[PDB]
UniProtKB/Swiss-Prot annotation:
Localization of this protein: Cytoplasm; Nucleus; Cell membrane
Family assignment from sequence similarity: Belongs to the protein kinase superfamily. CMGC Ser/Thr protein kinase family. GSK-3 subfamily.
Gene: GSK3B
GO MF entries: ATP binding; beta-catenin binding; dynactin binding; kinase activity; NF-kappaB binding; p53 binding; protease binding; protein kinase A catalytic subunit binding
Catalysed reaction, written as an equation: L-seryl-[tau protein] + ATP = O-phospho-L-seryl-[tau protein] + ADP + H(+); L-threonyl-[tau protein] + ATP = O-phospho-L-threonyl-[tau protein] + ADP + H(+); L-seryl-[protein] + ATP = O-phospho-L-seryl-[protein] + ADP + H(+); L-threonyl-[protein] + ATP = O-phospho-L-threonyl-[protein] + ADP + H(+)
Stretches assigned to the Protein kinase domain: 21-305
Keywords (A to Z) from UniProt: ADP-ribosylation, Alzheimer disease, ATP-binding, Biological rhythms, Carbohydrate metabolism, Cell membrane, Cytoplasm, Developmental protein, Diabetes mellitus, Differentiation, Glycogen metabolism, Kinase, Lipoprotein, Membrane, Neurogenesis, Nucleotide-binding, Nucleus, Palmitate, Phosphoprotein, Serine/threonine-protein kinase, Signal transduction inhibitor, Transferase, Wnt signaling pathway
Record protein name field: Glycogen synthase kinase-3 beta
Tissue: Expressed in testis, thymus, prostate and ovary and weakly expressed in lung, brain and kidney. Colocalizes with EIF2AK2/PKR and TAU in the Alzheimer disease (AD) brain.
Higher taxonomy: Eukaryota, Metazoa, Chordata, Craniata, Vertebrata
Amino acid sequence: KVTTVVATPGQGPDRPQEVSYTDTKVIGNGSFGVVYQAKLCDSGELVAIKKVLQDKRFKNRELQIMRKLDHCNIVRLRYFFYSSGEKKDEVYLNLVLDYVPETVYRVARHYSRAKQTLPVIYVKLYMYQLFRSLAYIHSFGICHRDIKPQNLLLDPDTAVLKLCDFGSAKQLVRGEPNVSYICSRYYRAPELIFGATDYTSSIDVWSAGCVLAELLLGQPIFPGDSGVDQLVEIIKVLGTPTREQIREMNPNYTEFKFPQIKAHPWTKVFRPRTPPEAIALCSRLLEYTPTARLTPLEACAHSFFDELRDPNVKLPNGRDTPALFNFTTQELSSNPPLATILIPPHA
Ligand SMILES: COCCNC(=O)c1nc(-c2ccc(S(=O)(=O)N3CCN(C)CC3)cc2)cnc1N
């Protein structure tokens, strides 16, 4: 069964094209509608169609953001078009994206069921690629707002990570308020747990540190039954924030959940047989103070990733490491002189 739809390229000139696809399989659900997997008849390559119900008296925020993005470690928007259900009003915006077979969550989840830890090289590979994607969208002022392992796609063979689900991403315009019940809990920055609406892109940096620590520990570092319990578990490990730290997180609130609980060391948080520059990265990612957290660009050049910058380092299945040095000037803009470290010898 071959379906032919008139789709506009998600990057290219505004030139609607006949796109034919088949093998339509549902893969995902959500707030927005439904996610499918499909095969382009002509090129035979697999794609994902994210189908959202669209009201025409406001443009889809995700769509405006997708048509401005293009990176190695981000699922690219190939096309978009409009469908409908039965009656009219009932307009569906459909996003044709690249399909990536696996996700970090489902990888991380197995090793955990096998009582095993993910090999450290995969931690470095997947965190570095995530940082690159973060430094790129933050250079536009776009904040994902929903970093979680299930929103990171992986190819098992090439070890390529591609960030997906831009449903909660938003251009942060300074002076416009921004909501605080964003982020998929567990990875919900301190500022948002206290209900701050004056946040920056560093909330993705926090969420990334929660993803890093989860891959190191083999389970979510900051669990919790609600937004309140997330604060308990953060305070359990990072201690009660100082009142200066509280002022920097949210310039609004403090309704003491309970008392000051103090911190316990990073060394005692993780497994003993795995404490290298990985613990130093977590201590630079998971800080209360938003301006004290690393930039995704500064995180890529951290000591923990230095194995990947070696010209001789090779993937576990013997293959080459995927592109880890093909930066743009937009991606380097926050700190251009960091290219000293980012681009090693080796071409
Ligand atoms: C709304 O936000 C974005 C929604 N998602 C995307 O856009 C997107 N999703 C994926 C994806 C990858 C893995 C899986 S899976 O859990 O490993 N698995 C589930 C069932 N199935 C039989 C096998 C696959 C599910 C989906 C890939 N590329 C995408 N472009």
